Amino acid sequence: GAPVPVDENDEGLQRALQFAIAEYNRASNDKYSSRVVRVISAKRQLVSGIKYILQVEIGRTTCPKSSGDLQSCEFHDEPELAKYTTCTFVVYSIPWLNQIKLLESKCQ
């Protein structure tokens, strides 16, 4: 057995970053929103089911949710002031039972 990396065509891995990341935005939703930036390690271990280990230097997005913006939101109008954080997402994905669940998703 071993770890298998994903490509730009794995709706499963996409549901992984969107699951944990979705939790990052709902976490900072207060001040503003947290948005991915430059992934680093997006993989899906393959055991009895799957393990989704993700890494990305999370970033932010000024606008919160409405702020009279309809649909936009953005980091800090540039990189010059949009630091980031290193977060890892751990999503177990089990086929045959469409059972996806979050696990080790922590950012810091």
Curated annotation (Swiss-Prot):
The record marks G1 as: Reactive site. GO terms for cellular component: cytoplasm; extracellular space; vesicle. It is found in: Secreted. Belongs to the cystatin family. One of its GO terms (molecular function) is cysteine-type endopeptidase inhibitor activity. Disulfide bonds join C63-C73, C87-C107. A motif (Secondary area of contact) lies at residues 45-49. This is Cystatin. The chain holds residues 32 to 139 of 139 of the full protein. The modification Phosphoserine is found at S72. Keywords: Disulfide bond, Phosphoprotein, Protease inhibitor, Secreted, Signal, Thiol protease inhibitor. This protein binds tightly to and inhibits a variety of thiol proteases including ficin, papain, and cathepsins B, C, H, and L. Although isolated from egg white, it is also present in serum.
